[PDB]
Design a protein around this ligand. Sequence first.
Ligand code: 3YD
Ligand code: GAR
Length: 200
Amino acid sequence: ARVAVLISGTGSNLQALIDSTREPNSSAQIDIVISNKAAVAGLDKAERAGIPTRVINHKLYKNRVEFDSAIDLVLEEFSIDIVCLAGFMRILSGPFVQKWNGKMLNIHPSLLPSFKGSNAHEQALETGVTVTGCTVHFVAEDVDAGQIILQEAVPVKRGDTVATLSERVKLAEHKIFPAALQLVASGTVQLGENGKICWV
Ligand SMILES: Nc1nc2[nH]c(CCCCCCC(=O)N[C@@H](CCC(=O)O)C(=O)O)cc2c(=O)[nH]1
Ligand SMILES: NCC(=O)N[C@@H]1O[C@H](COP(=O)([O-])[O-])[C@@H](O)[C@H]1O
């Protein structure tokens, strides 16, 4: 399966996916990395790995649908089968999500359905949980509400900050996102017709 990875930043999840998809038994190959932001570290990581990159600046588009169309054009250019959102911080439009239904994965740094949205660690710390984690899910129109593929729990330590908690949770992200991508790319896991996850 042919994979696009979309990023907005550092790209540690991208690097874990690069490492995993290059193992001999990988069912996935990363053929394009797309960032909505120029000069982010994730682009350096892709270049170093010899993977093509494109920058599609959302600021240059009239609306969300036009931006998504620009992304979709590149996905078609590279005959992409599966899209991974790896620190990509834009909400995708309904039609784009429907087109890629069952083919687009996101990583989120909480145990969904807790702490949906952009500041999950801040929320976890404010709430006072002692266990948080991360989730890989299929992308549905409603943000952070699509079908869950894998999750991993991560403890919150007393005195944690966003800095220390995000660091700990990223170790788990780098485990489950490669594992989830392999499950989908190999056809082991798919989005069922009834909308529920299906393990074959
Ligand atoms: N339909 C849909 N789009 C999705 N994008 C992401 C991936 C993570 C999305 C980050 C939140 C963006 C946000 O909160 N606000 C702005 C973006 C501001 C920014 O540039 O960071 C927005 O409206 O896009 C996940 C996901 C999803 O499950 N469903
Ligand atoms: N709403 C989505 C979200 O918060 N995503 C989070 O952004 C970080 C990106 O790090 P990276 O650029 O090092 O992969 C990751 O922690 C990811 O789970």
